[PDB]
Design a protein around this ligand. Structure first.
Ligand SMILES: CO[C@H]1/C=C/O[C@@]2(C)Oc3c(C)c(O)c4c(O)c(c(/C=N/N5CCN(C)CC5)c(O)c4c3C2=O)NC(=O)/C(C)=C\C=C\[C@H](C)[C@H](O)[C@@H](C)[C@@H](O)[C@@H](C)[C@H](OC(C)=O)[C@@H]1C
Ligand SMILES: Nc1[nH]c2ccc(Cl)cc2c(=O)c1-c1ccccc1
Length: 140
């Protein structure tokens, strides 16, 4: 399924893109290393209700694996991801959220296609440019 930017599914189910080999049944607590800043300990887990965002999460995750999209259930409260809320577009059209509490892995999505390679390379090259200019501010 070719991700359409800002398109929710009728489930409203929480998604999580990553390269981590997670399994159905896993409970995962906050505090892993950031995908964007070596050595940065995370206060939150990031989740999304759009397929587009979860694909970005699978493609941009650190690791040698192939991207995976997990279906997750938070144990506690979620809030708008500030990294993508009112930062260009008003509100939270990617429907990206974060939580200070653990999440359970309740399934895996298997029939999705990632972004065209020139889109993923453009995203990676833009992020390296914000790195080099010291404009890659990450809120957590
Ligand atoms: C769900 O979000 C995704 C897709 C959105 O879909 C889509 C269609 O809607 C977007 C919204 C609503 C944005 O508000 C946005 C944005 O604010 C932004 C970049 C950056 N794009 N660039 C590429 C080319 N460009 C010329 C330069 C920079 C974006 O592309 C988007 C963007 C999209 O592309 N940020 C910036 O420009 C700056 C100044 C800083 C970035 C800081 C950190 C590093 C990031 O925030 C990290 C923490 C992640 O949060 C993102 C990497 C998101 O990855 C995930 C997995 O979450 C990703 C945006
Ligand atoms: N979406 C994210 N937001 C972040 C915000 C802040 C910090 Cl310190 C880290 C992250 C981060 O690692 C991710 C992520 C990227 C790919 C796969 C899963 C999660």
């Amino acid at each position: 399924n070719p991700p359409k930017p800002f398109e929710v599914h009728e489930s409203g189910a929480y998604l999580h893109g990553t390269k981590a080999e997670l399994k159905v049944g896993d409970r995962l607590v906050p505090g892993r290393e950031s995908n964007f800043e070596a050595g940065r300990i995370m206060n939150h887990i990031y989740i999304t209700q759009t397929l587009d965002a979860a694909v970005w999460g699978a493609e941009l995750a650190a690791g040698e694996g192939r991207g995976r999209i997990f279906i997750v259930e938070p144990e506690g409260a979620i809030e708008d991801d500030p990294n993508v809320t009112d930062k260009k577009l008003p509100g939270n059209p990617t429907r990206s959220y974060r939580t200070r509490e653990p999440v359970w892995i309740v399934g895996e999505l298997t029939d999705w296609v990632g972004h065209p390679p020139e889109q993923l390379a453009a995203m990676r090259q833009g992020l390296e440019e914000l790195r080099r200019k010291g404009l890659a501010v990450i809120y957590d």
